[PDB]
Amino acid sequence: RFLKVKNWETDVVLTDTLHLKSTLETGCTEHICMGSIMLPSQHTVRTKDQLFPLAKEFLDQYYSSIKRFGSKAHMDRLEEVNKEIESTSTYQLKDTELIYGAKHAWRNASRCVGRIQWSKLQVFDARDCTTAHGMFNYICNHVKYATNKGNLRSAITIFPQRTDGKHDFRVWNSQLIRYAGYKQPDGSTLGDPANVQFTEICIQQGWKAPRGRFDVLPLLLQANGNDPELFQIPPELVLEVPIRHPKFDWFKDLGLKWYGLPAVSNMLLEIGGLEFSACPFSGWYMGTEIGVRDYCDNSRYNILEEVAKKMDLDMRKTSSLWKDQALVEINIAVLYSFQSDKVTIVDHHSATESFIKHMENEYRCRGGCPADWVWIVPPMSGSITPVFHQEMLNYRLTPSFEYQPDPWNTHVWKG
Amino acid sequence: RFLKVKNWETDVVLTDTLHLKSTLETGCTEHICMGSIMLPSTKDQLFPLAKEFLDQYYSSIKRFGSKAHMDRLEEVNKEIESTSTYQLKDTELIYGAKHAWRNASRCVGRIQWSKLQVFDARDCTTAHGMFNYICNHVKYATNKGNLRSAITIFPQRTDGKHDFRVWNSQLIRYAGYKQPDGSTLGDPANVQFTEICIQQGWKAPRGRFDVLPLLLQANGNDPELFQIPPELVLEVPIRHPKFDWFKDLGLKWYGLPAVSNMLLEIGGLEFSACPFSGWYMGTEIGVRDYCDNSRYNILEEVAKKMDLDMRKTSSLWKDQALVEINIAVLYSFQSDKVTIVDHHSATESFIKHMENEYRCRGGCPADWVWIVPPMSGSITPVFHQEMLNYRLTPSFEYQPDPWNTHVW
Ligand code: HEM
Ligand code: HEM
Ligand SMILES: Cc1cc(N)nc2cc(-c3ccc(OC(C)C)c(CN)c3)ccc12
Ligand SMILES: Cc1cc(N)nc2cc(-c3ccc(OC(C)C)c(CN)c3)ccc12
Ligand SMILES: C[C@H](O)[C@H](O)[C@H]1CNc2nc(N)[nH]c(=O)c2N1
Ligand SMILES: C[C@H](O)[C@H](O)[C@H]1CNc2nc(N)[nH]c(=O)c2N1
Ligand SMILES: [Zn+2]
């Protein structure tokens, strides 16, 4: 059964057959659409029972992609995985399989607008890691390689898979590089309000907080199920960009800066039924992630009103669109600062344009591209980007990146 | 299965039980979400539909299972039996129309749902009669710029051969013409309809802002052209509160959004002609009607006049122009005392409406893909609001364009 999507701005129609290969559930039914739920339970322990069917499905996938489906290499590997499961209750991916699986988890990430780049992912195999110090070293190297002095390169570092769920590797940080947030007694917040809870855990674990507005948080790394340990990223590894505006000289005076490398570190990579609970991945920013969300979200730095004041806008009534007007300027300043400093960034027009090209190519060479419109459309100027008028089909393919509960809610403390 | 929606800006959690009363289907399955698909897809089935409607009607008036309810149920049951259809009482007609708007999950303006003015036009027999009812609707709803919400309901479908239809997609829309040098004058969204009207006997002035004639179909006959009296068409000249050169662009828009091509379903009955109107959200003109590439596409001209660097997208010249255009649209309407709401006020109103509906009704079906405005989405409160989308009845539905289905 085929399904079609129409771009209503160009009348281009595409035919999705890939959705038949879908296994996991969406959360929707015939009578309710959960398309705007941030985490369907579906999007968030496993025995030898249900494991070999998942392994077989992944290996069939993998050997098809190398055009060796049904070969002796394919059938022998199936048997080898079978015996390793029945005797060890898990199994180990070859290097080739791990690289393929990680690239395809990104290719499958239906909320990621940056997926045109999915095949150019540098995969770092950290499955020989055993300790938190070992994790810190792998992460430092990831940060150095990814940053590349501003010429950002996508990368992922994969720590050992889950076994009995009692020996998990976890990065307790939500991203490798994030700014601390401090709740003051007067109710205000210093730094990034998005990180107040994690900052407090860090301070509790012994971190001496500078209590500044842009303190890079320490790494809180959990190896093999042990209590997590604190490490400071060497500051020369943290590339940062002072935010200025090309016409507004007072903009520098807001004291703002941001870090160059977005490296998400709290998601779970699933490949052939194996669960990689620690797998930080990084690329480069779309400007709106910093300029719209990171600075202008009401629950974030919320510099909108200050920028509004310094522009001397009518802040009395909302219908003056002072918020809209200040948001654009803040996003101009983010792009201008990164480009001036030669730090890789992409604006939301370029990125959505690339994504449509990626999506059309995926429909032709792959039969489909799962896409989450609610997440693909940029958080400003939605309808003047090409993805707004693009119909999209959302479904869940494996390998996948999944959400998982924050470790501090599930961790059994050693003391 | 008593579902919960969370607002990630406020942490407010709402519990939705209203979805369990949902009947129609969304187009999604457990294996695929079609939440961004624009248009997903008689005798036997009529009495259950009527029962369901009358059950909810008599519940709303706190007389479920009373003398009146059971009597009306059999009365309708008898009429369907013989006549093969049935006729709504005035009271049920008004209830069904207010609740078809209440249930329109893509409508951000539903906090106003209970103040709808319903015009019963079920006695109309001709396109001329339809034109009379529509002029009265337009005059009432315009109200000299103090716009009022309104719906006019023409006779319900019978055999599909006697359909009442308004062929326009809105009562008031600007013409669009194909030009020699390839492009388009007027309004590109209306090029096919503008040529149908010409293909009917309309002498087009061939300007930018030519108000289209009405093309009215009664009882299934060929449609007829009618000119809306210009004194009934309120227009706003578009100028900018800071940029004096903006008036030089020669733009205007009409005050009354009156959508006329949808179908109103109440208790199984199908009202194929049911023009309804309210007032504009600024972005419906300034973002979509002016800046969409498939529309007026004046963005590049605005940013040019603003002397913005249009050589790279990363200057955000489009975004900068888009905001100025929408500031002007709001400034122009407000200066002329024509009702209009900005996207910040309307979305804030919609969160309050959602609050209300969960508290007094158990839920509110809401289509996030359509509720979030087409600009500045994440700084409006609906962006961070989880929503549940489901189809309740009475409802407004899509229907094919008549010129694809009418036997001439
Ligand atoms: C290289 C440039 C990249 C860009 C510009 C980009 C952009 C984005 C954006 C804007 C989002 C939406 C998140 C939000 O707005 O809060 C997103 C989601 C996401 N990105 Fe990408 N990303 C990039 C690279 C990558 C890489 C290298 C990976 C993994 C290896 C990745 C995996 C994801 C995932 C898993 C999500 C969430 C998807 C889901 O939950 O289905 N991205 N990305
Ligand atoms: C009075 C102020 C109103 C405002 C500000 C408003 C706003 C909107 C907006 C912005 C949309 C999205 C359409 C688009 O962006 O292209 C919409 C959709 C819609 N509106 Fe409203 N509206 C109002 C009144 C009404 C009334 C009076 C009715 C009917 C009685 C109505 C019925 C609908 C319907 C049926 C849809 C499409 C829903 C669907 O397809 O499921 N609206 N509205
Ligand atoms: C590699 C990469 C680059 C980039 N430029 N951006 C990225 C954004 C996410 C991301 C961000 C936010 C988010 O949502 C949280 C608010 C829960 C999720 C969840 N799927 C993923 C993940 C990876 C990204
Ligand atoms: C009374 C009213 C007021 C308003 N201020 N705005 C309105 C917008 C629509 C509307 C607009 C577009 C649309 O869909 C097209 C893209 C085909 C639909 C159908 N869902 C309804 C319908 C009624 C509206
Ligand atoms: C592809 C997408 O479904 C289509 O462009 C929709 C998206 N959301 C929308 N939202 C509103 N309010 N109005 C629209 O016309 C649309 N168009
Ligand atoms: C409620 C809603 O689903 C939630 O706020 C989502 C909406 N879409 C988003 N889209 C992107 N790109 N990033 C986000 O964080 C969100 N948040
Ligand atoms: Zn859905």
Side-chain angles (χ1 to χ4, degrees), chain A residues 108-134:
Chain A
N108 290 344
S110 62
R111 296 179 168 166
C112 179
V113 73
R115 284 183 283 168
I116 191 182
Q117 303 275 1
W118 74 268
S119 63
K120 296 144 182 164
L121 178 63
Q122 180 58 234
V123 176
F124 291 120
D125 190 342
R127 290 176 298 168
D128 65 1
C129 195
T130 72
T131 70
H133 280 268

PDB file of all heavy atoms in Angstrom, chain A residues 108-134:
ATOM      1  N   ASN A 108      17.355   8.054  10.226  1.00  0.00           N
ATOM      2  CA  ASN A 108      15.993   7.726  10.604  1.00  0.00           C
ATOM      3  C   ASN A 108      15.376   8.737  11.544  1.00  0.00           C
ATOM      4  O   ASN A 108      14.218   8.555  11.938  1.00  0.00           O
ATOM      5  CB  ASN A 108      15.937   6.349  11.261  1.00  0.00           C
ATOM      6  CG  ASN A 108      16.183   5.249  10.284  1.00  0.00           C
ATOM      7  OD1 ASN A 108      16.098   5.462   9.077  1.00  0.00           O
ATOM      8  ND2 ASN A 108      16.510   4.058  10.790  1.00  0.00           N
ATOM      9  N   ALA A 109      16.121   9.760  11.946  1.00  0.00           N
ATOM     10  CA  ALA A 109      15.685  10.631  13.031  1.00  0.00           C
ATOM     11  C   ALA A 109      14.675  11.616  12.456  1.00  0.00           C
ATOM     12  O   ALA A 109      15.043  12.629  11.864  1.00  0.00           O
ATOM     13  CB  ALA A 109      16.874  11.345  13.666  1.00  0.00           C
ATOM     14  N   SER A 110      13.389  11.317  12.632  1.00  0.00           N
ATOM     15  CA  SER A 110      12.388  12.029  11.848  1.00  0.00           C
ATOM     16  C   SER A 110      12.223  13.484  12.285  1.00  0.00           C
ATOM     17  O   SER A 110      11.676  14.279  11.517  1.00  0.00           O
ATOM     18  CB  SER A 110      11.061  11.264  11.904  1.00  0.00           C
ATOM     19  OG  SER A 110      10.571  11.182  13.225  1.00  0.00           O
ATOM     20  N   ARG A 111      12.716  13.872  13.467  1.00  0.00           N
ATOM     21  CA  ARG A 111      12.671  15.271  13.893  1.00  0.00           C
ATOM     22  C   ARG A 111      13.919  16.078  13.511  1.00  0.00           C
ATOM     23  O   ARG A 111      13.982  17.271  13.819  1.00  0.00           O
ATOM     24  CB  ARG A 111      12.471  15.370  15.409  1.00  0.00           C
ATOM     25  CG  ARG A 111      11.163  14.816  15.927  1.00  0.00           C
ATOM     26  CD  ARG A 111      11.061  14.940  17.428  1.00  0.00           C
ATOM     27  NE  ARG A 111       9.692  14.658  17.856  1.00  0.00           N
ATOM     28  CZ  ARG A 111       9.314  14.419  19.106  1.00  0.00           C
ATOM     29  NH1 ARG A 111      10.203  14.402  20.087  1.00  0.00           N
ATOM     30  NH2 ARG A 111       8.033  14.187  19.372  1.00  0.00           N
ATOM     31  N   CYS A 112      14.903  15.484  12.836  1.00  0.00           N
ATOM     32  CA  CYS A 112      16.162  16.168  12.536  1.00  0.00           C
ATOM     33  C   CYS A 112      16.101  16.783  11.147  1.00  0.00           C
ATOM     34  O   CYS A 112      16.000  16.065  10.151  1.00  0.00           O
ATOM     35  CB  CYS A 112      17.361  15.207  12.611  1.00  0.00           C
ATOM     36  SG  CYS A 112      18.908  16.028  12.208  1.00  0.00           S
ATOM     37  N   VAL A 113      16.190  18.113  11.079  1.00  0.00           N
ATOM     38  CA  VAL A 113      16.209  18.788   9.786  1.00  0.00           C
ATOM     39  C   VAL A 113      17.571  18.713   9.118  1.00  0.00           C
ATOM     40  O   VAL A 113      17.672  18.990   7.919  1.00  0.00           O
ATOM     41  CB  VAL A 113      15.771  20.252   9.972  1.00  0.00           C
ATOM     42  CG1 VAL A 113      16.872  21.044  10.665  1.00  0.00           C
ATOM     43  CG2 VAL A 113      15.361  20.896   8.628  1.00  0.00           C
ATOM     44  N   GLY A 114      18.617  18.316   9.855  1.00  0.00           N
ATOM     45  CA  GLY A 114      19.974  18.362   9.330  1.00  0.00           C
ATOM     46  C   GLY A 114      20.437  17.093   8.632  1.00  0.00           C
ATOM     47  O   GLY A 114      21.631  16.934   8.343  1.00  0.00           O
ATOM     48  N   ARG A 115      19.496  16.203   8.311  1.00  0.00           N
ATOM     49  CA  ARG A 115      19.826  14.846   7.894  1.00  0.00           C
ATOM     50  C   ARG A 115      20.439  14.736   6.506  1.00  0.00           C
ATOM     51  O   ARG A 115      20.882  13.636   6.140  1.00  0.00           O
ATOM     52  CB  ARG A 115      18.593  13.964   7.973  1.00  0.00           C
ATOM     53  CG  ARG A 115      18.258  13.570   9.394  1.00  0.00           C
ATOM     54  CD  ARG A 115      17.078  12.637   9.394  1.00  0.00           C
ATOM     55  NE  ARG A 115      15.838  13.374   9.180  1.00  0.00           N
ATOM     56  CZ  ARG A 115      14.673  12.801   8.902  1.00  0.00           C
ATOM     57  NH1 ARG A 115      14.585  11.487   8.779  1.00  0.00           N
ATOM     58  NH2 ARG A 115      13.584  13.554   8.747  1.00  0.00           N
ATOM     59  N   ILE A 116      20.542  15.823   5.739  1.00  0.00           N
ATOM     60  CA  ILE A 116      21.238  15.709   4.462  1.00  0.00           C
ATOM     61  C   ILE A 116      22.669  15.213   4.683  1.00  0.00           C
ATOM     62  O   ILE A 116      23.282  14.628   3.782  1.00  0.00           O
ATOM     63  CB  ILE A 116      21.222  17.046   3.693  1.00  0.00           C
ATOM     64  CG1 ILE A 116      21.700  16.839   2.258  1.00  0.00           C
ATOM     65  CG2 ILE A 116      22.075  18.106   4.398  1.00  0.00           C
ATOM     66  CD1 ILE A 116      21.748  18.113   1.447  1.00  0.00           C
ATOM     67  N   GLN A 117      23.214  15.443   5.871  1.00  0.00           N
ATOM     68  CA  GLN A 117      24.597  15.144   6.210  1.00  0.00           C
ATOM     69  C   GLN A 117      24.783  13.750   6.808  1.00  0.00           C
ATOM     70  O   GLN A 117      25.896  13.429   7.241  1.00  0.00           O
ATOM     71  CB  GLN A 117      25.109  16.202   7.198  1.00  0.00           C
ATOM     72  CG  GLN A 117      25.005  17.644   6.709  1.00  0.00           C
ATOM     73  CD  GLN A 117      26.203  18.047   5.866  1.00  0.00           C
ATOM     74  OE1 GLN A 117      27.101  17.242   5.630  1.00  0.00           O
ATOM     75  NE2 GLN A 117      26.228  19.299   5.419  1.00  0.00           N
ATOM     76  N   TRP A 118      23.727  12.919   6.822  1.00  0.00           N
ATOM     77  CA  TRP A 118      23.713  11.711   7.650  1.00  0.00           C
ATOM     78  C   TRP A 118      24.842  10.752   7.292  1.00  0.00           C
ATOM     79  O   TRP A 118      25.321  10.008   8.154  1.00  0.00           O
ATOM     80  CB  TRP A 118      22.366  10.989   7.520  1.00  0.00           C
ATOM     81  CG  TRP A 118      22.183  10.260   6.199  1.00  0.00           C
ATOM     82  CD1 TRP A 118      21.602  10.756   5.057  1.00  0.00           C
ATOM     83  CD2 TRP A 118      22.590   8.911   5.885  1.00  0.00           C
ATOM     84  NE1 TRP A 118      21.630   9.809   4.065  1.00  0.00           N
ATOM     85  CE2 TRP A 118      22.228   8.667   4.546  1.00  0.00           C
ATOM     86  CE3 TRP A 118      23.231   7.892   6.608  1.00  0.00           C
ATOM     87  CZ2 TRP A 118      22.484   7.446   3.910  1.00  0.00           C
ATOM     88  CZ3 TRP A 118      23.489   6.680   5.975  1.00  0.00           C
ATOM     89  CH2 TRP A 118      23.114   6.467   4.641  1.00  0.00           C
ATOM     90  N   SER A 119      25.254  10.719   6.029  1.00  0.00           N
ATOM     91  CA  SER A 119      26.262   9.749   5.631  1.00  0.00           C
ATOM     92  C   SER A 119      27.682  10.201   5.955  1.00  0.00           C
ATOM     93  O   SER A 119      28.608   9.394   5.835  1.00  0.00           O
ATOM     94  CB  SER A 119      26.144   9.436   4.136  1.00  0.00           C
ATOM     95  OG  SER A 119      26.381  10.586   3.344  1.00  0.00           O
ATOM     96  N   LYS A 120      27.871  11.458   6.352  1.00  0.00           N
ATOM     97  CA  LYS A 120      29.186  11.986   6.706  1.00  0.00           C
ATOM     98  C   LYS A 120      29.254  12.165   8.221  1.00  0.00           C
ATOM     99  O   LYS A 120      29.303  13.270   8.757  1.00  0.00           O
ATOM    100  CB  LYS A 120      29.442  13.300   5.975  1.00  0.00           C
ATOM    101  CG  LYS A 120      29.521  13.183   4.466  1.00  0.00           C
ATOM    102  CD  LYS A 120      28.907  14.398   3.790  1.00  0.00           C
ATOM    103  CE  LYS A 120      28.947  14.262   2.280  1.00  0.00           C
ATOM    104  NZ  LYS A 120      28.023  15.225   1.624  1.00  0.00           N
ATOM    105  N   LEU A 121      29.208  11.035   8.912  1.00  0.00           N
ATOM    106  CA  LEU A 121      29.258  10.987  10.364  1.00  0.00           C
ATOM    107  C   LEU A 121      30.518  10.237  10.768  1.00  0.00           C
ATOM    108  O   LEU A 121      30.734   9.114  10.313  1.00  0.00           O
ATOM    109  CB  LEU A 121      28.044  10.267  10.950  1.00  0.00           C
ATOM    110  CG  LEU A 121      27.981  10.093  12.474  1.00  0.00           C
ATOM    111  CD1 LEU A 121      27.905  11.432  13.198  1.00  0.00           C
ATOM    112  CD2 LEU A 121      26.793   9.220  12.880  1.00  0.00           C
ATOM    113  N   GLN A 122      31.325  10.846  11.625  1.00  0.00           N
ATOM    114  CA  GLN A 122      32.542  10.220  12.122  1.00  0.00           C
ATOM    115  C   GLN A 122      32.195   9.422  13.373  1.00  0.00           C
ATOM    116  O   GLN A 122      31.745   9.991  14.373  1.00  0.00           O
ATOM    117  CB  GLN A 122      33.601  11.281  12.407  1.00  0.00           C
ATOM    118  CG  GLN A 122      34.914  10.706  12.931  1.00  0.00           C
ATOM    119  CD  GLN A 122      35.541   9.692  11.987  1.00  0.00           C
ATOM    120  OE1 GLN A 122      35.834   8.567  12.383  1.00  0.00           O
ATOM    121  NE2 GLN A 122      35.738  10.082  10.734  1.00  0.00           N
ATOM    122  N   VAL A 123      32.370   8.103  13.319  1.00  0.00           N
ATOM    123  CA  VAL A 123      31.933   7.227  14.402  1.00  0.00           C
ATOM    124  C   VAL A 123      33.155   6.822  15.219  1.00  0.00           C
ATOM    125  O   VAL A 123      34.114   6.270  14.676  1.00  0.00           O
ATOM    126  CB  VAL A 123      31.192   5.992  13.862  1.00  0.00           C
ATOM    127  CG1 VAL A 123      30.832   5.058  14.991  1.00  0.00           C
ATOM    128  CG2 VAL A 123      29.916   6.430  13.077  1.00  0.00           C
ATOM    129  N   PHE A 124      33.121   7.110  16.513  1.00  0.00           N
ATOM    130  CA  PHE A 124      34.180   6.765  17.443  1.00  0.00           C
ATOM    131  C   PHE A 124      33.690   5.618  18.311  1.00  0.00           C
ATOM    132  O   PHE A 124      32.681   5.747  19.017  1.00  0.00           O
ATOM    133  CB  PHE A 124      34.582   7.972  18.286  1.00  0.00           C
ATOM    134  CG  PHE A 124      35.276   9.048  17.503  1.00  0.00           C
ATOM    135  CD1 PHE A 124      34.744  10.334  17.436  1.00  0.00           C
ATOM    136  CD2 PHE A 124      36.462   8.780  16.832  1.00  0.00           C
ATOM    137  CE1 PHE A 124      35.387  11.327  16.723  1.00  0.00           C
ATOM    138  CE2 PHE A 124      37.113   9.770  16.108  1.00  0.00           C
ATOM    139  CZ  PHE A 124      36.573  11.050  16.056  1.00  0.00           C
ATOM    140  N   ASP A 125      34.374   4.484  18.205  1.00  0.00           N
ATOM    141  CA  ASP A 125      34.044   3.256  18.931  1.00  0.00           C
ATOM    142  C   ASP A 125      34.702   3.315  20.301  1.00  0.00           C
ATOM    143  O   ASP A 125      35.903   3.048  20.438  1.00  0.00           O
ATOM    144  CB  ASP A 125      34.536   2.046  18.137  1.00  0.00           C
ATOM    145  CG  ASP A 125      34.036   0.720  18.683  1.00  0.00           C
ATOM    146  OD1 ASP A 125      33.597   0.658  19.848  1.00  0.00           O
ATOM    147  OD2 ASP A 125      34.083  -0.274  17.924  1.00  0.00           O
ATOM    148  N   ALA A 126      33.921   3.653  21.325  1.00  0.00           N
ATOM    149  CA  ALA A 126      34.402   3.657  22.702  1.00  0.00           C
ATOM    150  C   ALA A 126      33.882   2.472  23.500  1.00  0.00           C
ATOM    151  O   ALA A 126      33.691   2.579  24.719  1.00  0.00           O
ATOM    152  CB  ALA A 126      34.033   4.967  23.398  1.00  0.00           C
ATOM    153  N   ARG A 127      33.631   1.340  22.832  1.00  0.00           N
ATOM    154  CA  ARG A 127      33.073   0.182  23.522  1.00  0.00           C
ATOM    155  C   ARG A 127      34.099  -0.548  24.389  1.00  0.00           C
ATOM    156  O   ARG A 127      33.711  -1.453  25.142  1.00  0.00           O
ATOM    157  CB  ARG A 127      32.464  -0.789  22.512  1.00  0.00           C
ATOM    158  CG  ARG A 127      31.184  -0.260  21.856  1.00  0.00           C
ATOM    159  CD  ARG A 127      30.699  -1.213  20.803  1.00  0.00           C
ATOM    160  NE  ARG A 127      31.670  -1.357  19.731  1.00  0.00           N
ATOM    161  CZ  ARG A 127      31.615  -2.297  18.797  1.00  0.00           C
ATOM    162  NH1 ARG A 127      30.626  -3.181  18.801  1.00  0.00           N
ATOM    163  NH2 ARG A 127      32.543  -2.350  17.852  1.00  0.00           N
ATOM    164  N   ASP A 128      35.378  -0.164  24.328  1.00  0.00           N
ATOM    165  CA  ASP A 128      36.393  -0.732  25.220  1.00  0.00           C
ATOM    166  C   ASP A 128      36.559   0.083  26.495  1.00  0.00           C
ATOM    167  O   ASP A 128      37.345  -0.297  27.371  1.00  0.00           O
ATOM    168  CB  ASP A 128      37.743  -0.884  24.492  1.00  0.00           C
ATOM    169  CG  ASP A 128      38.371   0.450  24.079  1.00  0.00           C
ATOM    170  OD1 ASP A 128      37.813   1.533  24.341  1.00  0.00           O
ATOM    171  OD2 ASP A 128      39.468   0.407  23.477  1.00  0.00           O
ATOM    172  N   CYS A 129      35.804   1.174  26.627  1.00  0.00           N
ATOM    173  CA  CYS A 129      35.847   1.995  27.826  1.00  0.00           C
ATOM    174  C   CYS A 129      35.348   1.211  29.034  1.00  0.00           C
ATOM    175  O   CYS A 129      34.434   0.389  28.922  1.00  0.00           O
ATOM    176  CB  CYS A 129      34.983   3.248  27.615  1.00  0.00           C
ATOM    177  SG  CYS A 129      35.290   4.512  28.820  1.00  0.00           S
ATOM    178  N   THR A 130      35.959   1.452  30.202  1.00  0.00           N
ATOM    179  CA  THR A 130      35.527   0.790  31.429  1.00  0.00           C
ATOM    180  C   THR A 130      35.289   1.726  32.599  1.00  0.00           C
ATOM    181  O   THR A 130      34.604   1.323  33.548  1.00  0.00           O
ATOM    182  CB  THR A 130      36.541  -0.276  31.881  1.00  0.00           C
ATOM    183  OG1 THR A 130      37.712   0.373  32.385  1.00  0.00           O
ATOM    184  CG2 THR A 130      36.919  -1.194  30.746  1.00  0.00           C
ATOM    185  N   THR A 131      35.813   2.947  32.580  1.00  0.00           N
ATOM    186  CA  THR A 131      35.732   3.834  33.730  1.00  0.00           C
ATOM    187  C   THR A 131      35.323   5.230  33.284  1.00  0.00           C
ATOM    188  O   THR A 131      35.449   5.590  32.107  1.00  0.00           O
ATOM    189  CB  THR A 131      37.074   3.939  34.473  1.00  0.00           C
ATOM    190  OG1 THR A 131      37.995   4.662  33.648  1.00  0.00           O
ATOM    191  CG2 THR A 131      37.633   2.550  34.770  1.00  0.00           C
ATOM    192  N   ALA A 132      34.881   6.021  34.268  1.00  0.00           N
ATOM    193  CA  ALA A 132      34.488   7.405  34.016  1.00  0.00           C
ATOM    194  C   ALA A 132      35.654   8.220  33.482  1.00  0.00           C
ATOM    195  O   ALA A 132      35.494   9.011  32.550  1.00  0.00           O
ATOM    196  CB  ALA A 132      33.941   8.039  35.295  1.00  0.00           C
ATOM    197  N   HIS A 133      36.846   8.044  34.060  1.00  0.00           N
ATOM    198  CA  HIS A 133      38.018   8.701  33.502  1.00  0.00           C
ATOM    199  C   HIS A 133      38.219   8.312  32.047  1.00  0.00           C
ATOM    200  O   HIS A 133      38.609   9.146  31.222  1.00  0.00           O
ATOM    201  CB  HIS A 133      39.271   8.343  34.325  1.00  0.00           C
ATOM    202  CG  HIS A 133      39.419   9.128  35.591  1.00  0.00           C
ATOM    203  ND1 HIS A 133      40.138  10.303  35.653  1.00  0.00           N
ATOM    204  CD2 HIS A 133      38.972   8.894  36.848  1.00  0.00           C
ATOM    205  CE1 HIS A 133      40.116  10.766  36.891  1.00  0.00           C
ATOM    206  NE2 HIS A 133      39.411   9.932  37.634  1.00  0.00           N
ATOM    207  N   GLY A 134      37.982   7.038  31.711  1.00  0.00           N
ATOM    208  CA  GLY A 134      38.078   6.638  30.315  1.00  0.00           C
ATOM    209  C   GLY A 134      37.058   7.357  29.457  1.00  0.00           C
ATOM    210  O   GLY A 134      37.338   7.733  28.315  1.00  0.00           O
TER     211      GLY A 134
END
